[PDB]
Structure formats: structure tokens, C-alpha cells
């Protein structure tokens, strides 16, 4: 009757929560955290210093949105965190109220973006070992968890370790290949554009292309993206002229409800049905620094690894992540990759003649469930493995060596 | 009831039961370890994938050959491969049957003593023996007189023999072997425009040479015909799908055997070394040695090699007798067949070395056992 460990997938967006050895993440709540801050002016020599017990006088989760007298302040920003005191407060609140798990008799696994600096991991591990006194800890990249969860798509019994994952995120979407359990360290790239700035662009365009909404209830209006309201588009200008020609049937309407005066307000739906999701393959719209597509990045990263691994990698691309829920995404990526790889093969064959014909490279995109969350099941299987109880860093290791035990990274080595 | 014969080839390992006409285990000598961080913790990760599997997943491993030019460099790798072959593949306990080992001539005594000590101590084999690949080649060929051309992957050597006796003073060993040929092939493939550095591409080039290489009767004529490059170039399909066109390199690398000066070695070719070895022998046995020339090893399967060797020897030798080259089509496993036949011999059942005599005497016993 051994107690199960605890599985947590922290991040910038909706933080997944639940226990190991289970088939559904029970709690999925935002990162919004309340605080009894107000208007002091001395805010850089006493940030808060709440007198008495007012320090803990703050809510958390979905209940924290509807508190109109505090401040909703997200602690995370695309992985990197400025102030981690809010993170500690959120962690204690969750573990006690929601999870109800005693740290001294439980094992915690945490997930961080691959670009997280060593200092943040070291100091969060130190904080955990000092305050929570967790017997064991383990941090790993989320790509492998997604790969493990991808087995459920079809033929679980057929072991398939090779592949590559392009995961989404509220502020980051990364690319990580797997070569029979061992990933490549140098063949990893970080994409800054993600599923948040897209909504920023949507609302920015909407605030001028339409009127009839209140400033407060903007994001709820901007969340038409999460609805059926965005389809990807093999061509841009074609659909532009399609809308500018008819502009009658392709236009949709919004019927949101105000959260203050309970007065209905409506606005039409325009070019944003596709432009947002199209920004992924044209990031230049939002971020001027990163004028680089995604599919070509995928082929480049897959072309910077040994020959024997290039072939199977193209065959296994996993559709996991919230921002990847957009329809026809896989078709576009598959078609683009096939076109570029076929062109490269033809160029290679042109220089050296021959009547032969190489077997065409096969690129296939797999669509399945688990797309919204592919890290939780990986953590559950992580906990269920007995070897996890042995690999996890121990207390005595942190006792005198320090929190450096958690500094191991997949893209470092001397 | 039987015995096991294991040939620790410089590039491949052959093993099987005594009596069978074909080996039951043929895998290359590779002991690979992961190069990356060791990040995954699920389904299958092992600290050292050494063995047959290593070839399949060579793309994320630093393959290293335990044996280099006939002499062992890392004993841990050799013990690991021995354990793998004995247990995973053969699935036969060492105690049940004895083991037969073979090694190239003119090897250091330290290697022999260490191998015997490890075999007798770790696996506690009831008995074993040490022999020479060339003599087993003779046994496989069913002949008692001739000259052996044992051009293996790591070492090439010759050992003149006569009816019922050998000539230890006329043994020549050449370090040139398949590995040097592969290195030269990589170097020339670089001059063509194709680059290969790591060990995985080393295996790829090894396969390419195994499939699309041959010897040239005349070097200058072949070069001239290459100047008219419209019927000699051939194409090979790489795993990634890229196509590589190979022309003069097909008949250039094998010529290094007859022209060691290409690699910069101040030595002579196989023909010259065999001529010198035969000349150092007595006059009367020269006729018999000329009439019988056995060759074995994986480096002598190139088509036309026998014809070129015959032509060169006849040109060097006086043009008044007949020189014959015998090229059996199963020379790859000739050593193993000879070892099996020797083990099957009734008279050899007493020549083995047992644990009692080894312990009482010491490791030096093997030195006096048939040299």
C-alpha cells in the first residue's frame, strides 16, 4: 500500500495538476494568483511586507479571477520568472488546499522549459528541500513525457521510441527530437512566439476593426480563437479576396455576455479566423526579431543530426499541445516538409546522374487525443516506474553538496 | 559431448559448435556506449550497448573496436563480448563444454597469458587450447603443403608449411589490413567530394567497399579507361536516400595492397612478401609451395585478386614451371571450419589444457604448448 507520488506540470499557462497512476489530470487551473497589494508608493524597498496575517490573505485559481479588489498578477512569463515568491505561495496553496499532500512523505516531479537557466532550477530545488522537505525530487524536459503519451495513439504494444515533438505553450513552443530514447542536445531551438502573442494580435486588430465591447472583458472576447473560430489556410491572398468578394457567408458573429451589466453585445468575425493560426508559419507578423518559419526550422533541426537517424525521425511527428489544436495544421506542415525534402533530394540527384530512383522519403503527421495535455501522463508513468524512486535526488545529496544536484541539463557537459 | 570454437577476428567474431559446417553466431566486434546525456529513463536504456545491436543503433553511439591490428587494447570490452557471445547468443555455460581460441602469429606473449588467465579464472572453462588461423585454414582445405595468405581485417600474414612440419623462421606479418583500406577509401572519397568522419560513416564506407570494390589487372590501363569515364562509374544508395557515384575509387583502394607506398608505409606488397618468404625456404620445397597457394580471410574476396596474384608471381618467378592459385568460395569461414575439424579429431582430445595442470604449472604452460 505504498503512497503514490505527486505529478505537477507547472508553466506559464494553465497549470496541470493531479496525482500519478491516474488517467485524467483532475485539476487544471490557471496561474492567476491574488494578493493584497494596493497603491503604496514605496514599492521598491518593501515590496509588500503585509502586516500580521494579511500576507496569506490571497486566493488562487479560477476563483481568483472574480475578486475585483486585489491584483491578478501572473508570476510566470514564457518560462523565465521575475519574482518567485508568488510561485512559492501558489505551490503551498495548491499542495495544501487542492492536492492535500504532505511533502515529507511524497515525491514531486516538476517540469520546466528547456531554456530555463540553471540558476532558477537550482534555487527552486533549494526552496523545495528547505521548506517542503520533500524526500525526493526530479525535473526533466516535457518532450519525453509527450513522446510516452503519444504511444496511446495506436499500437501501444509496438515500441516506438524514435520521433520528434513540437510542443506548444502559453509563451513558448519548442522542438525536440528523440532518437531511440536518446535526444540530441545541440539540435534544439527555442521559439519565442506562442499561443499568447497570437491573442494579443487578435485583440489589437479587433480593437480597431470593430467596436461594441468593454475594455475589461477583452480577453474573453479575444478567446474566439479557442472556439471553432480559426482554420489554417494553404493560401493567404486567395482567402483574402474570397472574403473581400463575398464577405457575406464566410463572416461569423459573436454573442458574448457582459460580466458587469448583463447586457448582450455582439461583433462580427473577420480576417482573424485564419491570420492568427497562420502566424505560426509566418512569425514575422508579431515578433520582428524572429523572421523564421517553423516547418523549415523542423527540417533544419532534423538535418543537423546523424544520417542513420534522419530517416525514422521524419516518420514520427507528434501533434501534442494546445496551440496545435488548430485544424489542418498537420496537413500544412506535412505538405511543406514533403515539398522541401523532395526538392532537396532532386537537387542532390541532379548533380550526379543515374537511371536509378530513390524510394521517396515518407513524412506523416499523426493526429490523436491528448493534444491539450501530453505532459501529465508522462509524469504519471515517470512516477509509476520503480527506477524513479532510485534516480531521484536524495536529501543527503542536497544536505552538503548543495542544490546543484538538480543542475543537470540535456544541452550541457564538460 | 562437443566443444566450442571461437575466432576473435580483428573485425568480426565467429563461433559455433564443433561438428557443424556453418557458424551459429556471426556478429561484428563492436562495444558501443551512449554519447549523449543518458536522459531517457523509460523502456530501454543500457549503459553499454556492445554487440550485434550496436550496429542497428550506431547513430548515437561511439563505436570502438576492442581489437586493433590483431592485438587487444581494452580487456573490459573483450570480456564483455565474450560474455555476450557465450550467454545471449550461444546460451551455453562455459563449464559444459571446452573452448578453442585462435590468434595471429608473432603476437606478444602477454596477450596469450592474459587471455588464458581470464578464461581459466572468470569462466572456469574445463579446458581450452590456442592455435593459429593458418594451420586451421590448411585443415579446412584438406591439404598438408602450401602457403597461407591469411589477409584478415587487422593483420595479413603468411606461414610456409611442408608435409608434417612447418617453417617458423619464414613467417612474415604485415600490419596492413582492411582497416587501412577503409581509411584510405575515406580519404579518397573526400577528394571526390563526399565526406565521412565518424564511426557510423566508417561502417557505411565498409559496406560500400564490401559491395562495390574490385581489383584491376593493369593499373595504368584502368586509369586510362577511367579517363573515358562512361562505362565504369556506379551508383550507391545511402540510408538517407542520397546517391553517391564511385569511379576510379573502386579499383584504387585495393591496389594499396600491392602498393603500400600509397599510405606511406615503407614495406612491400603481398606478392613481394610471399616471394621473399618462399625464397627463404629450402630449394626443394619451393616447387611444392609454388604448386599450392592457399589464401583465406575477408580481405581477399575481391574479384580478380587471384588472377592478379598469379600474374605477378609468374612474372617474378622463373617462367619455366606452373603456378596455380586456389580460391575456394568459402574462405571467409575457413578458419572456423579448420578449428571444428581439429577439435573433432580423436588424437586432439588429449592435447587440451585443463585447470589442474594450468594451476599447478602456471600461465607459462601455453607458451610451450605448440609455440
Amino acid at each position: 500500500g505504498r503512497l503514490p507520488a505527486c505529478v505537477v506540470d507547472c508553466g506559464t499557462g494553465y497549470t496541470k495538476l493531479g496525482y500519478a497512476g491516474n488517467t485524467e489530470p483532475q485539476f487544471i487551473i490557471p496561474s492567476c494568483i491574488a494578493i493584497k497589494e494596493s497603491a503604496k508608493v514605496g514599492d521598491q524597498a518593501q515590496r509588500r511586507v503585509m502586516k500580521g496575517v494579511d500576507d496569506l490573505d490571497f486566493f488562487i485559481g479560477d476563483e481568483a479571477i472574480e475578486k475585483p479588489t486585489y491584483a491578478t498578477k501572473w508570476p510566470i512569463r514564457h518560462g523565465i520568472v521575475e519574482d518567485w515568491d508568488l510561485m512559492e505561495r501558489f505551490m503551498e496553496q495548491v499542495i495544501f488546499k487542492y492536492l492535500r499532500a504532505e511533502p515529507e512523505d511524497h515525491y514531486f516531479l516538476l517540469t520546466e522549459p528547456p531554456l530555463n537557466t540553471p540558476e532558477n532550477r537550482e534555487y527552486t530545488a533549494e526552496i523545495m528541500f528547505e521548506s517542503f522537505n520533500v524526500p525526493g525530487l526530479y525535473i526533466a524536459v516535457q518532450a519525453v513525457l509527450a513522446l510516452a503519451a503519444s504511444w496511446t495513439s495506436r499500437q501501444v504494444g509496438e515500441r516506438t521510441l524514435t520521433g520528434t515533438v513540437i510542443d506548444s505553450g502559453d509563451g513558448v513552443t519548442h522542438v525536440i527530437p528523440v532518437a531511440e530514447g536518446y535526444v540530441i542536445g545541440s539540435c534544439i531551438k527555442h521559439i519565442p512566439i506562442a499561443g499568447r502573442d497570437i491573442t494579443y494580435f487578435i485583440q489589437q486588430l479587433l480593437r480597431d476593426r470593430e467596436v461594441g465591447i468593454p475594455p475589461e472583458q477583452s480577453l474573453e472576447t479575444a478567446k474566439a480563437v479557442k472556439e471553432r473560430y480559426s482554420y489554417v489556410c494553404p493560401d493567404l491572398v486567395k482567402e483574402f479576396n474570397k472574403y473581400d468578394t463575398d464577405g457575406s457567408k464566410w463572416i461569423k458573429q459573436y454573442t458574448g455576455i457582459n460580466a458587469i451589466s448583463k447586457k448582450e453585445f455582439s461583433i462580427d468575425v473577420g480576417y482573424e479566423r485564419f491570420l492568427g493560426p497562420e502566424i505560426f508559419f509566418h512569425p514575422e507578423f508579431a515578433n520582428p526579431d524572429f523572421t523564421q518559419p517553423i516547418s523549415e526550422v523542423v527540417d533544419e533541426v532534423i538535418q543537423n543530426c546523424p544520417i542513420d537517424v534522419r530517416r525514422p525521425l521524419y516518420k514520427n511527428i507528434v501533434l501534442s499541445g494546445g496551440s496545435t489544436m488548430f485544424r489542418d495544421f498537420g496537413r500544412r506542415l506535412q505538405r511543406d516538409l514533403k515539398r522541401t525534402v523532395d526538392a532537396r533530394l532532386k537537387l542532390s540527384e541532379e548533380l550526379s546522374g543515374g537511371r536509378l530512383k530513390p524510394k521517396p522519403i515518407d513524412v506523416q503527421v499523426i493526429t490523436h487525443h491528448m493534444q491539450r495535455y501530453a505532459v501529465w501522463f508522462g509524469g504519471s508513468m515517470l512516477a509509476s516506474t520503480p527506477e524513479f524512486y532510485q534516480v531521484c535526488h536524495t536529501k543527503k545529496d542536497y544536505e552538503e553538496i548543495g542544490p546543484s544536484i538538480c543542475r543537470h541539463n540535456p544541452v550541457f557537459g564538460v | 559431448t562437443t566443444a566450442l570454437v571461437c575466432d576473435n577476428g580483428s573485425g568480426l567474431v565467429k563461433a559455433g559448435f564443433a561438428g557443424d559446417d556453418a557458424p551459429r553466431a556471426v556478429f561484428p566486434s563492436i562495444v558501443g556506449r551512449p554519447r549523449h546525456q543518458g536522459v531517457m529513463v523509460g523502456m530501454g536504456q543500457k549503459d553499454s550497448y556492445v554487440g550485434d545491436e550496436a550496429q542497428s543503433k550506431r547513430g548515437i553511439l561511439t563505436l570502438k573496436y576492442p581489437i586493433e591490428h590483431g592485438i587487444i587494447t581494452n580487456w573490459d570490452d573483450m570480456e564483455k563480448i565474450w560474455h555476450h557471445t557465450f550467454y545471449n547468443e550461444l546460451r551455453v555455460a562455459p563449464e559444459e563444454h571446452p573452448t578453442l581460441l585462435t590468434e595471429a602469429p608473432l603476437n606478444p606473449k602477454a596477450n596469450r597469458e592474459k587471455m588464458t588467465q581470464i578464461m581459466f579464472e572468470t569462466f572456469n572453462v574445463p579446458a581450452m587450447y590456442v592455435a593459429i588461423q593458418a594451420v586451421l585454414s590448411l585443415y579446412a582445405s584438406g591439404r598438408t603443403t602450401g602457403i597461407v595468405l591469411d589477409s584478415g581485417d587487422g593483420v595479413t600474414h603468411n606461414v610456409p608449411i611442408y608435409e608434417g612440419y612447418a617453417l617458423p623462421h619464414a613467417i612474415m606479418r604485415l600490419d596492413l589490413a582492411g582497416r587501412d583500406l577503409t581509411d584510405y577509401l575515406m580519404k579518397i572519397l573526400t577528394e571526390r567530394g563526399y565526406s565521412f568522419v565518424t564511426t557510423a560513416e566508417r561502417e557505411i564506407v565498409r559496406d560500400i567497399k564490401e559491395k562495390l570494390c574490385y581489383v584491376a589487372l593493369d593499373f595504368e590501363n584502368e586509369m586510362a579507361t577511367a579517363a573515358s569515364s562512361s562505362s565504369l562509374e556506379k551508383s550507391y544508395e545511402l540510408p538517407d536516400g542520397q546517391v553517391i557515384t564511385i569511379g576510379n575509387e573502386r579499383f584504387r583502394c585495393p591496389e594499396t595492397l600491392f602498393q603500400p607506398s600509397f599510405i606511406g608505409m615503407e614495406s612491400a606488397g603481398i606478392h613481394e612478401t610471399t616471394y621473399n618468404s618462399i625464397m627463404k625456404c629450402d630449394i626443394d620445397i619451393r616447387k611444392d609451395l609454388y604448386a599450392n597457394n592457399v589464401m583465406s580471410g575477408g580481405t581477399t574476396m575481391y574479384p580478380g585478386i587471384a588472377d592478379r596474384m598469379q600474374k605477378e608471381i609468374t612474372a617474378l618467378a622463373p617462367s619455366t614451371m606452373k603456378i596455380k592459385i586456389i580460391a575456394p568460395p568459402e574462405r571467409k569461414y575457413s578458419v572456423w571450419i579448420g578449428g571444428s575439424i581439429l577439435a573433432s579429431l580423436s588424437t586432439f582430445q588429449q592435447m587440451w589444457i585443463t585447470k589442474q595442470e594450468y594451476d599447478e604449472a602456471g600461465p607459462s604452460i601455453v607458451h610451450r604448448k605448440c609455440f
Partner: peptide
């Protein structure tokens, strides 16, 4: 390069 590496 043409095969192996870019150049």
C-alpha cells in the same frame, strides 16, 4: 560539401 556537411 555536396555530400556530408553543407558546403
Amino acid at each position: 560539401w555536396x555530400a556530408x556537411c553543407p558546403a
